[PDB]
Design an enzyme around this catalytic site. Structure first.
Site, PDB file in Angstrom:
ATOM      1  N   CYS A  31      20.898  -6.088  -1.396  1.00 32.80           N
ATOM      2  CA  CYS A  31      20.019  -7.004  -0.572  1.00 32.80           C
ATOM      3  C   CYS A  31      19.841  -6.834   0.858  1.00 32.80           C
ATOM      4  O   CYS A  31      20.876  -6.782   1.684  1.00 32.80           O
ATOM      5  CB  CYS A  31      20.788  -8.540  -0.823  1.00 32.80           C
ATOM      6  SG  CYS A  31      20.487  -9.944  -0.011  1.00 32.80           S
ATOM      7  N   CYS A  34      20.655  -9.338   3.467  1.00 37.88           N
ATOM      8  CA  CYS A  34      22.071  -9.578   3.395  1.00 37.88           C
ATOM      9  C   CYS A  34      22.928  -8.575   4.516  1.00 37.88           C
ATOM     10  O   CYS A  34      23.959  -8.972   5.089  1.00 37.88           O
ATOM     11  CB  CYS A  34      22.830  -9.287   2.063  1.00 37.88           C
ATOM     12  SG  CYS A  34      22.374 -10.480   0.778  1.00 37.88           S
TER      13      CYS A  34
END
Length: 108
Positions: A31, A34
């Site tokens: 991600c 993230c």
């Protein structure tokens, strides 16, 4: 004081039973956003360490906990107090923005 890693197996002891409030970061290794929020969380975990625990939950390794708290998108943060989810934050943002959003106070 840095973040802790938590999992389905440890969530009750390390998040729900925490004496301190716990900000849980739901994230995944693939991600992109993230990765941007990770350093903000480490900064907060250090600066607010006496008052706050910051925990990281890899949703791909722990999809049960993600499902249980209705976390679909990532990065998503949920603040826990005394076992109870009390507030959700969605997305990567800077430390000032994040702390203000987390707060229930507003500046006058």
């Amino acid at each position: 004081i840095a973040t802790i890693e938590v999992s389905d197996a440890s969530f009750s002891t390390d998040v729900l039973a925490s004496n301190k409030p716990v900000l849980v970061d739901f994230w995944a290794t693939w991600c992109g956003p993230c990765k941007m929020v990770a350093p903000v969380l480490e900064e907060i975990a250090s600066e607010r360490g006496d008052h706050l625990t910051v925990a990281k939950l890899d949703v791909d390794a722990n999809p049960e906990t993600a499902q249980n708290f209705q976390v679909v998108s990532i990065p998503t943060l949920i603040l826990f107090k005394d076992g109870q989810p009390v507030k959700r934050i969605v997305g990567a943002k800077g430390k000032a923005a994040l702390l203000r959003e987390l707060s229930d106070a507003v500046p006058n």
